[PDB]
Amino acid sequence: TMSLGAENSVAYSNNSIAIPTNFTISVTTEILPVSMTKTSVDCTMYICGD
């Protein structure tokens, strides 16, 4: 059975808060298609050539 990730139970109370004390710069990558291969088909040479 595939796992859905880790299991973390964050503590919730009416008086406690979590403040971050440091930070990090994350350079992620995202790939996105823009164009494709333009294809021109010849009708006669494909249906019956020569």
15 in contact with ligand NAG (CB under 6 A) = yes
Question: Helix, strand or coil for residue 45?
Answer: helix
DSSP 8-state secondary structure symbol assigned to residue 29: -
Q: Segment contacting ligand NAG (CB under 6 A): 4-12, 20-28, 34-42? A: 20-28
Q: Segment contacting ligand NAG (CB under 6 A): 1-9, 18-26, 27-35, 40-48? A: 18-26
CA gap 24, 19 in Å, rounded: 15
Site for ligand NAG in 24-43 (CB under 6 A): 24
User: What would the 3-class secondary structure string for 22-43 be?
Assistant: CCCCCCCCCCCCCCCCCCCCCH
Instruction: Tell me which residues touch ligand NAG (CB under 6 A).
Output: 14-15, 21-22, 24
